[PDB]
Amino acid sequence: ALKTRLGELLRPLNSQYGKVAPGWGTTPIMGIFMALFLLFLIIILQIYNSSLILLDISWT
Amino acid sequence: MEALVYVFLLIGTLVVIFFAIFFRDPPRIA
Amino acid sequence: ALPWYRVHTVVLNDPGRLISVHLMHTALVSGWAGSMALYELAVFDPSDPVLNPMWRQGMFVMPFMARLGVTDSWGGWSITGESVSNPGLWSFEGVALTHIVLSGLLFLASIWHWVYWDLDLFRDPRTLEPALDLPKVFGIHLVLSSLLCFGFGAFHVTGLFGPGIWISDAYGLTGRIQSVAPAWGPEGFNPFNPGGIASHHIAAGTVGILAGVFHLNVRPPQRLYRALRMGNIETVLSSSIAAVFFASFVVSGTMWYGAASTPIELFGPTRYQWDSGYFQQEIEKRVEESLSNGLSLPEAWSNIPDKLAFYDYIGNNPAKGGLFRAGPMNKGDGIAEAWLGHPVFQDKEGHELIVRRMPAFFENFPIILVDKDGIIRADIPFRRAESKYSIEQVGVTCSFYGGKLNNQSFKDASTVKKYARKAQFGEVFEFDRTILDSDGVFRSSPRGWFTFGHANFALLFFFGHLWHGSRTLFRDVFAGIGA
Amino acid sequence: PLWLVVTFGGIVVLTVLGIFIYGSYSGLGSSL
Amino acid sequence: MVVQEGGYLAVLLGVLFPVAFLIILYIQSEARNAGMREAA
Amino acid sequence: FRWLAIHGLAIPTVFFFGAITAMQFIQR
Amino acid sequence: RYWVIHSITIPSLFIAGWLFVSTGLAYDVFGTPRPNEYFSENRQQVPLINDRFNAREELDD
Amino acid sequence: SGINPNKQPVELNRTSLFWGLLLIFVLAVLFSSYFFN
Amino acid sequence: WFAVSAVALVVVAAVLVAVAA
Amino acid sequence: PSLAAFFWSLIWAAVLVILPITGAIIWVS
Amino acid sequence: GWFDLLDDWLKRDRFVFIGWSGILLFPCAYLALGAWFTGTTFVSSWYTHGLASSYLEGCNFLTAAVSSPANSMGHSLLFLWGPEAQGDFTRWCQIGGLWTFTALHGSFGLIGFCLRQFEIARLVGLRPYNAIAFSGPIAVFVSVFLLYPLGQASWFFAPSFGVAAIFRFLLFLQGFHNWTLNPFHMMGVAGILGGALLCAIHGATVENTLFEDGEASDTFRAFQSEETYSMVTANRFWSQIFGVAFANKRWLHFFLLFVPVTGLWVSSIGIVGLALNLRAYDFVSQEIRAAEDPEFETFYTKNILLNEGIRAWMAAQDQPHENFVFPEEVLPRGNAL
Ligand code: CLA
Ligand code: CLA
Ligand code: CLA
Ligand code: CLA
Ligand SMILES: CCCCCCCCCCCCCCCC(=O)OC[C@H](COP(=O)(O)OC[C@@H](O)CO)OC(=O)CCCCCCCCCCCCCCC
Ligand SMILES: CC1=C(/C=C/C(C)=C/C=C/C(C)=C/C=C/C=C(C)/C=C/C=C(C)/C=C/C2=C(C)CCCC2(C)C)C(C)(C)CCC1
Ligand SMILES: CC1=C(/C=C/C(C)=C/C=C/C(C)=C/C=C/C=C(C)/C=C/C=C(C)/C=C/C2=C(C)CCCC2(C)C)C(C)(C)CCC1
Ligand SMILES: [Fe+3]
Hints:
The structure is cut from a larger assembly and holds 11 protein chains of 11 kinds. With 30 residues, chain B is mostly helical. Chain B is 70% helix and 0% strand.
């Protein structure tokens, strides 16, 4: 393989291949943020769909 | 004279069919 | 050997040539942007921003350059109607040429990365095998993307250090590039509120950055790493495709229903505005207000701008086109010359008759003149005999208020019938159908074409997502099964 | 007996269906 | 008949660009095939 | 799940069958 | 052996549906018009709903 | 740079050739009528 | 002005030439 | 009122999504 | 573990498999199907279409349906707790909440079923081609029951869940969109008819190239790694009859996977097109020619006339909210009729 200056500079950024956290690690937190995200998308969807009236969804 | 193009495409298809039939590579038993 | 489809798999385990190939794709896309811009500029007519704006001329990349600040040309004109003398580097032509140069550079870079594929950066120190730490790479890329997002929201949109965004009034008459203050309240989630845009990016950006930090420091859970096959790049392909068709459905939606990021002066009006008579109701309101001010009826209608009257014309309804009717809208009815003014129909009793407007569903529509109570007073009969509502029999007159035909009255049945058909299409305008040899059939707007293309692309990418996700999760058996 | 059960049940089903068909000629939906 | 002229191009370009594509692949395929069948 | 499914389909089916018969005798 | 509880419940449900129709409870539940409730003495036209957010007050009239 | 090991040959049997020709020409027929309009 | 863009291009180019060797 | 209806929808949904969840857990041990 | 115990219980070998996918699938499937029965039996469409729609009113299986919401509702999701029904179940049914109910629950149901195919495939250890093939039908449902009305004015113009109602949707798309003229639909037809052709011809061929693996005339009982039919004989037969035959069983079975699925996808492209009224309605050349030349006629123009008829007459009855009034003198028609 060819070693380059940029490659040597960027080398540590690609050295932790395969390294994982034991078990579920941070999965529950991720699931929390996912649930919150679903809530958000549903909220803005209902706002746009006028199923959730707060703010008029007309040309302002 | 789009008729020329239509005739061309049809003749093309029919030719493809002809060669697909009489110029196929023969199936060979194992 | 590889079947023709599967050809592109030869880049899967070759990071360098994957990068090269992506560079080639990117070069092609930017190159297309530049070329398209040049073609549009070569065919565009800037002489009338009112009755011949960009969306009447088939412009597809113009409104996107306009949306974010580039509104001037080196030709000395603007799509706002103003006259500049020196736009600087970032005119339309500038954007095009810079995209071309970018395309060239990406092209050369692609060549280099194809040639020198065996970089040590792509090798794993412990196995000498090609390997990419996709989680950390995702961390870096997410940091870049989020930083750029925050920057775009805080400077470009706000005007703190940037041009701003295209903003117009509720009826698309005074559109211009303006600085937009971020709306942090719930009103920022109003799709028609420009402020939202700013705030969004800012907020999103910030959160993204935070996420970046996390994804830069914390390794993935082993169970998630195993489940999502994070050692295989095709899972990244699957997820990315998913995100992409999600975004595609979103932009299709916002384009069709309308948003603060899809102005009607850039992409044309919506079908729902014709559905609800948006502009019609507005014009009536303004006219009645002018009558309250003591002005007469033709004086009231004369105050109505040609632009507003143009918006209330079904020929600018994006839901009146055809899939194989090629070209700009001007290829259909022609290039809009004048507003003729508002036609008022009346019977011999003085009832104000309105011609039944054509709905978007109908390629053609019977001509029916109805009164204020929705009662049939006139029409144009198919069968002539035994008819009882013909204009020759009922006796109807048409008087124009405002526009070119202002204060002209028509009492003869022929001319009244004429203006009646024309009236079923909304307001009446003048048209140049010689310049482009118009074929006399309605075409869609850039809004329609965009919505079509992106909706269908989104669907197809739903498939793509299913297929690559399948190949990812079933990698071990995609060549067959055992006992 | 299984066959007797199947026969009886089948006759019942056909009877209900027959009642529906009769219902197409009487009451609502009969054009009467 | 007033038709869209671009059609001509479209059709021909469309039709001829994959056709060539196929032919290219096919013939080289066969070449390789032959080689491998020969040295066996 | 066997009970839940079988009854989940069968119970409303009988309910509805009764209803529809009753409808067969509704006069104008 | 398992035909007993079924001989006590299956006819019960059958009759329950029958009664759900014969008592006219179905009409009240699903708002389905009776053969004499399509047109009143006041309205001779089809009672379509025109207001999206005021469909209750409109259906009441 | 060194010789690339990821290179692979491409195959296209005569059946695929004929299926491809058939696909292209038939598609052409159809859409041709729509392109001319 | 043209200053920021030109300076930016010169910086990027400088990085390129520097890491090139 | 629509927001309250949204929150209440989340409430009923949470109840009738805890029902199957807990159902599965009780038959799990 | 907790999750591991959940997984173990959900993936148990029952008479009816469940799984995580089952958690999504079974509720939504049940509710969609049940809503269809409930609606077609009890609920009317008097306040939305001005139509009788249930068995309770006198509809039979052919004319009963769960009709689309009132046009005035727009693209409202029409939640039971929505600002339109405001909790009132009766008003909810009168508005057309059952349609959105059925549509959404049906959609998530389809998601759940596809996920079920994926899950069972992975558990057993098979290739997930069943799910892909099923991506087909999904594309149909999403494009026709969701995308098309979302592109139009409201859910009102979406297909109503019923036989004659679906028929109405059909003739509507013909009269208004000239849907038969659309090339994507033609590809769809090619896919379906081709699929049925492949099914029939494969079935017949295998059944009639069977090996004598028994003495009974009942060849069914006589059925291992050995092929039960002669591929070579089949190949010979169709080669001498049709000119071309299959030779590779794998390619054959993939092919009769591919044809119909592709059909469905293509027609879906078409339907999206129609969602935006981006139709393949006309051939401008022939319209111009016919406009200038009153002696020029093709089956295309004849069908255009047919469309115009459809549109008038049905326009008045099919869209009651529009209050369309067409005097009998303006209705297009020929002589005598
Ligand atoms: C996000 C973009 C993306 C990317 C990077 C890939 C990448 C890949 N796909 Mg894939 N795919 C995608 C989206 C994507 N796909 C979508 C959206 C779909 C749904 C339609 C599919 C459906 C799909 C299938 C069904 C298959 C792949 C396969 C492959 C692999 C080989 C592809 C190849 O050599 O093509 C070869 C292509 C050609 C030689 C030319 C054919 C070109 C067609 C006829 C039209 C192309 C359009 C035109 C040229 C340009 C328009 C671009 C458009 C996006 C606007 C490769 C890993 C194959 C695979 O798994 O291999 C192992 C495979 O069988 N893909
Ligand atoms: C990432 C999102 C994004 C996007 C799409 C835009 C888009 C735009 N911005 Mg903008 N901006 C952004 C983020 C973004 N900005 C951020 C985060 C900031 C933070 C401060 C700004 C600040 C900003 C300012 C201050 C200004 C803009 C302007 C513009 C407009 C013209 C710039 C342009 O087209 O560049 C396109 C650039 C390329 C395609 C790159 C091409 C690269 C080549 C190499 C250029 C070299 C050309 C040269 C002549 C040839 C060299 C030869 C070679 C051998 C070296 C355009 C609408 C300008 C504007 O609207 O003016 C009216 C303007 O004044 N922006
Ligand atoms: C998907 C993105 C997209 C979108 C939405 C648009 C939108 C538009 N373009 Mg544009 N364009 C694009 C990409 C896009 N373009 C690309 C990638 C190029 C480079 C080739 C161009 C080049 C271009 C030019 C040169 C022109 C336009 C023009 C236009 C405008 C009118 C186009 C029209 O009538 O459609 C016509 C559309 C069709 C006829 C649809 C094609 C039929 C579908 C795709 C089915 C085909 C499938 C079939 C299997 C393939 C053919 C079969 C083959 C084997 C024979 C419109 C605003 C015009 C314009 O701006 O006016 C000045 C114009 O002159 N475009
Ligand atoms: C519609 C059918 C469908 C099917 C069969 C699949 C199948 C698959 N997807 Mg997938 N996906 C889909 C749609 C689908 N997807 C959609 C619409 C999106 C959004 C863009 C995604 C986004 C996505 C991502 C990001 C990833 C997958 C992945 C996968 C694979 C792993 C299984 C998985 O994660 O499923 C996920 C399926 C679900 C979560 C089902 C959705 C259930 C939701 C939460 C119901 C909640 C709705 C709510 C309560 C009510 C809404 C109300 C509203 C009307 C207002 C598998 C091949 C993964 C993969 O391939 O990695 C290898 C992966 O990383 N998918
Ligand atoms: C007097 C007798 C008259 C017989 C009637 C004439 C029949 C003509 C049949 C031509 C078949 C051409 C096949 C080309 C493609 C070809 O050569 O494929 C050859 C292929 C052989 O498959 P193998 O099993 O050998 O493939 C193994 C691997 O190569 C797979 O990758 O046959 C098939 O795939 C079966 C499907 C054929 C059925 C195709 C029907 C298409 C009908 C024509 C549609 C267009 C008509 C347009 C008219 C304007
Ligand atoms: C090298 C170089 C350079 C140059 C560059 C250039 C020149 C670029 C260009 C670029 C370009 C110029 C690009 C383009 C692109 C385009 C595209 C990408 C397109 C696409 C399209 C498509 C693909 C489609 C097609 C079609 C149609 C639609 C019709 C017919 C059929 C077909 C399919 C063909 C410079 C000096 C600057 C610098 C550096 C070096
Ligand atoms: C809506 C809703 C819901 C739901 C409900 C449900 C789920 C229901 C169900 C329902 C059901 C679940 C029903 C069922 C029904 C059934 C039926 C109605 C049946 C019929 C049958 C028949 C008619 C038969 C036929 C036949 C066959 C099968 C074959 C042979 C021949 C014959 C003809 C015999 C809830 C409450 C949750 C919530 C609210 C809303
Ligand atoms: Fe078979």
